[PDB]
Enzyme design. Sequence first.
Site, PDB file in Angstrom:
ATOM      1  N   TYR A 148     -37.323 -92.909  56.608  1.00  0.00           N
ATOM      2  CA  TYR A 148     -36.631 -92.309  57.740  1.00  0.00           C
ATOM      3  C   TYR A 148     -37.642 -91.959  58.825  1.00  0.00           C
ATOM      4  CZ  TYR A 148     -32.730 -89.875  60.005  1.00  0.00           C
ATOM      5  OH  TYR A 148     -31.732 -89.494  60.873  1.00  0.00           O
ATOM      6  N   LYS A 149     -37.147 -91.458  59.953  1.00  0.00           N
ATOM      7  CA  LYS A 149     -38.002 -91.161  61.094  1.00  0.00           C
ATOM      8  C   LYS A 149     -39.073 -90.154  60.706  1.00  0.00           C
ATOM      9  CE  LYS A 149     -34.213 -90.584  63.526  1.00  0.00           C
ATOM     10  NZ  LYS A 149     -33.300 -91.572  62.886  1.00  0.00           N
ATOM     11  N   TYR A 150     -40.333 -90.562  60.863  1.00  0.00           N
ATOM     12  CA  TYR A 150     -41.439 -89.808  60.278  1.00  0.00           C
ATOM     13  C   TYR A 150     -41.520 -88.411  60.863  1.00  0.00           C
ATOM     14  CZ  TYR A 150     -46.214 -88.313  59.378  1.00  0.00           C
ATOM     15  OH  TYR A 150     -47.328 -87.589  59.018  1.00  0.00           O
TER      16      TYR A 150
END
EC number: 3.6.4.-
Lengths: 497, 511
Positions: free
Chosen positions: A1-3
Amino acid sequence: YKYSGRDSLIFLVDASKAMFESQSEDELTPFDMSIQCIQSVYISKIISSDRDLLAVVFYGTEKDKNSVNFKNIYVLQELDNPGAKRILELDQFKGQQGQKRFQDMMGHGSDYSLSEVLWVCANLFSDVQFKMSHKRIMLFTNEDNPHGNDSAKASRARTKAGDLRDTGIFLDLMHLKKPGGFDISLFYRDIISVHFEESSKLEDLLRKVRAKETRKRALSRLKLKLNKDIVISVGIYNLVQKALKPPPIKLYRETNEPVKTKTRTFNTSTGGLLLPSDTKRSQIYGSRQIILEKEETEELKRFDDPGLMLMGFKPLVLLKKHHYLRPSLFVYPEESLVIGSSTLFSALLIKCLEKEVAALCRYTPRRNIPPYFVALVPQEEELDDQKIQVTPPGFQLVFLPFADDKRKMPFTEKIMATPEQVGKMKAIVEKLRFTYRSDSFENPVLQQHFRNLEALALDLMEPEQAVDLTLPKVEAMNKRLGSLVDEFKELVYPPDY
Amino acid sequence: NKAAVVLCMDVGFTMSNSIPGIESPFEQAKKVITMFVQRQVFAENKDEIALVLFGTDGTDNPLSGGDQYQNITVHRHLMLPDFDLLEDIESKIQPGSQQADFLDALIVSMDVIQHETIGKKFEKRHIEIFTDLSSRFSKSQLDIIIHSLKKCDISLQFFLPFSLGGITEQQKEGLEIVKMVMISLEGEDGLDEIYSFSESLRKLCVFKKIERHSIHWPCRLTIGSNLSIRIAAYKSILQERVKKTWTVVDAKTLKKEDIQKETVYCLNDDDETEVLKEDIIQGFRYGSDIVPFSKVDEEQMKYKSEGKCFSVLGFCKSSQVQRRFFMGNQVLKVFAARDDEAAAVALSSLIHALDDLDMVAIVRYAYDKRANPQVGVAFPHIKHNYECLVYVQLPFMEDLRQYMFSSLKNSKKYAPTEAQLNAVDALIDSMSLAKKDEKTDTLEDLFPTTKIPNPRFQRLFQCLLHRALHPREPLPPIQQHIWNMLNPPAEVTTKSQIPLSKIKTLFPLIE
DNA sequence: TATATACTAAGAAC
DNA sequence: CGTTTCATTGTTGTTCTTAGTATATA
């Protein structure tokens, strides 16, 4: 997922008189159990993922405050990055005196409605601005039917909970403990993602770990080029890193403020101030002095543009374990740069696996770095135990040492043993068997340093003084092998030490 | 250890002429001696160098005579190498017009060694003579010369234009005499001490390898609590970094002492300056806030250890650990402390048992007190000269990382078609850097990478040279021999055109 | 007794 | 036309440097 997103876990405990003083026996207490669980997980999250978000919010209380000024809801500590200032707030409630404080400050436990509890904890997630990677809600209750009396409340409960399930938020309860009433098909089979009176799912939240993690963080993306024309996109990732203790920060002695180090360089002959252009690098050879540009002292390393240089291939027996040099890395295609390169990567991986052969390459991680020789030894994926990733599929990066590394050994002669000693050593080595698992051990230093960190953060009555599997368990070796040490002594030991 | 170096070049007449297609022995051996002085210049080894440029048009030597010890100019006596000597050699040398004996120069350097190698402490002496064997020499003192070389501990080597595997009868009988002399020194192996000039280039071109002595660390290999064994730990592979750092020096004055890298600690408010080394106490980040830890409490609450504590935690299968997980900075070699044979045989029993039962040991490790402990594989190794055991750091749990890495056998979006597959087969078979040789399955490892010098150090020494031999001049590019060194041997590149060509028509290569 | 040689352990730089 | 909200580009962690202390060796 979005870091950049971050994990967020909110805590929510039944504050009714139900479990505040259930205490059927005198060995536990559900509130003293739920608060213990919260304290343990939250202190673990301190060290583990300090970047994440936690919050604790009680429902059914008699005093009130929240974002919307509702009834019987208390947001004890809002969603924010974890910290000691809240370790203490939670610890303030741990105890029979502590439960007395809790009840006479917020309440015995009034009427409630988990609809309004879900409505309000939703608001908490909505409030904070940082992007969230995962969003989890932990209930702490054992009133397995929240209300068999007002069906409308329960209908609204399914509605709002289904909404939360579709706003991106998960929800979870561990059935803590109840005399009877220890079922989940009663109103909760449609809520959470057979049954008993206590949850194994809460026991592991006491495992009390101090690891730390980083997400799928590409160490460096480099374009592997088969030749001067074919180029594929490879993400050099890291799978073992040798964590060091977090770098300390220099603080002022009373004021505990940051001190903003301001190192500089200037002249001795005059009180001037040398600037970075104003200095030269130097060596001393052959009784003569050398001068180069600070720019040139890094230009002396320019060797190849960043990327990977495949030359040929080698048999996996010729690549030798005997000459490890640096922590290995991992190779996996990154589809973003050269579209379709993942296909060629997969082709190379499969075919090399088939013919049991290594791949050799020149590795230049960044600019201004001399190249080393690295082996792209393919790795097969294994999932057998529970169909979960264990060995990611791709290529190793077995760095190959350069000649200046061999460190010529001070040759000594050899003496063969007699097969009698090795025959008994067969049993010796058999007896001391133990299966080794990758995560078997911990750094006593790192663990103890973190422990002392909590100890000082809290002044909790002693430091934990963790004992760790690094030290051998001496009695085990003396016992399970027997006294065969004296056998090998009478075999191959003269009187002198 | 110590060594004495006395190079001996001839400046006669014959080396002034040669075949136009090959450089004359004069300039050939001249480049050779230049870059040899380069070698023992960059290496900080205490080798002392002397030079004898015999065959001189004059005679400048301590043993000057009308016919005894004639036509010799000792360039400089046996002291340390230095740049100006190299420059003078590159310049002061001149083509000659005479011819002179080399036994003369050999005895002269012999006398220099006997006169200086005892006046200063030394251990081993080397004499090297470069010539073309076009001299008039008598075999008078050869017996006495070789006797003294045996007694004065000096090794004689000759370096000659021809190859062992078109010279004058003068040169031919000189070569036979040289064979006689070398065999009269060491034995039949004296043939290897004969050297040409092209192979000297080939064997010398690289800069000096950075040899690095390890430390005899003895330790008590502990298994159980009553089977202590003295164990000698040695390092095998270490990421080697240059010895002495780039000293920072001020421009236009070029003194080190004129610069101070003093550090000052301030406060964020009004730029108040804090007192440098007593008002600061080190803190740590625990979530939001900072805990006033300190240094004294650090040393008081720090984890302690008994000491060496190389104690075996247990034994495990070979596959129980894997290549990937090896988490070491450096790879030790685990050998018996010498002079205690019983320990050695016990360790040999250990090693062979682990080998045949493919078992591997896991041992707690620590170099010493006040150092972080360490757990990792103890791998046993077998060599016909000696059995071996090696230790490598293996991860602690916090050090291990986990990732999903969505798999590849789901390649319904990538689809490696059979044309691509057999193409890649043609590749990995065709670019096969290693191919079986001598029927011994020793594949074509003419890219061992284990004997190849680290190009970083090569470039560093080349830079120091090129800007030492010259005043301020722009830097040169990478010497082509370094690139040929780094690149794969040509034949592999030759075999690769067709398979890569068939690649380029079988895959997408978007920008 | 002096000297350097080794090491690790720091640091900060990028 | 003005105000508010959202999304994205700069952000860094790691490596190397120097330090410091370490000891035995000559």
